[PDB]
Symmetry: D2
């Protein structure tokens, strides 16, 4: 089994399994049933941005989602990732569609993690920034229905020639290199993530959502995780 | 008067003004009597490191102070700087000695400020890093007894020709350019500062401390602020 | 007088003072008569990008100006800046109009300088990035007709309410803090500059140009530097 | 065979295959016989620093190697990597010993690559920094006798338990993720690499050297490339 820690941008309310009755953003720790959630005033057809942050001093996983000139949605949860996740992990982006669908497009993605290990001036750091994706992005691990190059964008789920969303689709993108998320010797550890997305459904009835996640290096799409399980969990517990 | 937000590294206990009875680390918001403090096992003669962090999402100001292979001191305070400070500020380092003394030497200093706009993605940033100080450091505003180039180091208080600390001394060093610490349109705003220091004392007990501060662009050293006022406050209120 | 090292994006061909007979880009060292020019196919009304780079190992100042989905113009010049400029300088953008005119709008500006001394890891660095300009941009020194905040942009020369450019106009924007561009104890030194611009002439007959420049700390606009002198030089010698 | 572009730090003079008669730094493109070399005053037992740089505008690979308060060695070669290397590559460090030996210890290593493509300032970037190596560095591909965690350093060739180097040794360390080194839609492309090293030898003469290299993704050690071939080439052609 994998260990997933995610920040879902949930477009469809699945009250049958704990989702509030409106689109929302939330923090998921080893389960699809969020530990915290916030109402999200999603805008069909508009590009948004998600900013997720974390540091080992405060120990709070926070996220902000916004649209230009609109209001932002924020969610936070006090969690000590050292007691939840492996020391080495992989970071990625995931999306799905079920009976209902939307386009789960990624226009840009950035990530930075730093580990100050006790010593002065002895810091390990990792940073990548994709402002454009190519047909053969050799530094990404594509899973499910994910593809790159489509207008220099990253399409996580299946979209037809006529730019139309398809149902029952799941796709993930993981950065190639493993990331050292925490350590014991470190005096300060922190990470920062950011992405811009374009979710649009012609019927104006979207599903199911996008999720930024952190997992064990060898994570793969669970069977049956289409739709409401955001391609991250095996069951809805 | 000036608007001061500071993180003090207080080496002497002036219990008559609130100081706990032991060296400490504290967060000062417009008053010398810390809002929250933490015990700090200062190590005479050793180079230590401090890291200060803040972001508009969480609205918490945190600090960690350590020496390699030893424990760390942490102190945090929930404060919405939008209500305390002006939109444009200057950042600096301050230090003082009174009846007792110590060296207040800075070996390195870095700062990073970031502000993401309302019309999402209009990120503006400022970053400076000093791992060495020149005799004529034109990008710093030195106030009081502060001098640079002294071994490639920044001395905040007066040291003698033979390297011995001096009493009744105050000095400050401010970066030349004003910083846009916050905005009403920003989605996310955050800063991070790091400095290494060497505090050495030849007498019974060290005094008085070093402090990282944020002020109004035109801040000057308050009259008589040597000793327990750390070059930042005019009175002990 | 002042010491000016500049990269001019010259819109009007003044053959009488040495300008080639078409819009061009050139390297200027203390004179308006470029040491090296390259033909530039200016595109009226379109946003362009200029990248300027330099390092002390190669001792080459190069510049690339381009427009999306269009070919670019490059120009380089071998010059040891240690012999031309002072140690501490100021960086900026300058523009002008004369009999003919154009809009000289800047949409973004970033600068990074690094100085690696004789100390392992001991690099000093400065970085600033403006992706949006405020009405009261306290970290800039505006000279002449330059203003900011107008559409979140920096307008180097005068533009009337109805968006119409004006003639006989001059303006300059310089970053507030002095920059240590070179140092004798340096193993390596280098800077990188980038800005996006919009030059539009409703008459389809533009003049005079924009320039990225490096000067002495207290540089000011020369008397009678309007038009062909781009606000940089006091004569055409 | 693989495709190799390397910057060598050659401690032993093999004049029989072209080496100058003294320790040197050189630029290798597909062959062990450097295209250009420069005399290097290697200091046995001391920590040195290597700095490599390249950009697509000037098309010249340069390198500087130095020790604190000592002169530096510099080498440059005009080379269009677009014509030598594939689009996707891997970067690493390589070292070897033969009949003679030395320690090929790496104390830190950083790399930064930037790629600006077909848009109004659309950059892609990758940055990594190791100021300390762990016993299990998941983001590095170790080959041959290379090992990490050894006092937090990286030892490229075999060292004895007491601390003495072994002969006939070879080892490499490549960063885990592929790097998009060049692209046809790019306006500008550039990279910067830096590492500090420690070569000590109890022998009458040290051998054989360290090399910073760039190769095809699936590169591995050529059989018998110990000694003078520096773990990079099959033969001496
Ligand atoms: Ca749901
Ligand atoms: Ca005190
Ligand atoms: Ca002209
Ligand atoms: Ca050799
Ligand atoms: Mn949910
Ligand atoms: Mn106190
Ligand atoms: Mn000209
Ligand atoms: Mn050689």
């Amino acid at each position: 089994a994998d260990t997933i820690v995610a920040v879902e941008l949930d477009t469809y309310p699945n009250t049958d399994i704990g989702d509030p009755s409106y689109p929302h953003i939330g923090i998921d720790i080893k389960s699809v049933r969020s530990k915290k959630t916030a109402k999200w005033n999603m805008q069909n057809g508009k590009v948004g941005t998600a900013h997720i942050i974390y540091n080992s001093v405060d120990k709070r996983l926070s996220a902000v989602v916004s649209y230009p000139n609109a209001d932002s949605a924020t969610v936070s949860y006090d969690v000590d990732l050292d007691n939840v996740l492996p020391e080495w992990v992989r970071v990625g982006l995931s999306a799905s569609t079920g009976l209902y669908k939307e386009t789960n497009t990624i226009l840009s993605w950035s990530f930075t993690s730093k580990l100050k290990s006790n010593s002065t001036h002895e810091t390990n750091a990792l940073h990548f920034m994709f402002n454009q994706f190519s047909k053969d992005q050799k530094d990404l691990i594509l899973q499910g229905d994910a593809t790159t190059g489509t207008d220099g964008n990253l399409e996580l789920t299946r979209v037809s020639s006529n730019g139309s969303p398809q149902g029952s689709s799941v796709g993930r993108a993981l950065f190639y290199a493993p990331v050292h998320i925490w350590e014991s010797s470190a005096v300060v550890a922190s990470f920062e993530a950011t992405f811009t997305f374009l979710i649009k459904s012609p019927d104006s009835h979207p599903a199911d959502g996008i999720a930024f996640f952190i997992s064990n290096i060898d994570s793969s799409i669970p069977s049956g995780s289409t739709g409401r399980l955001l391609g991250l969990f095996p069951d809805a517990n």
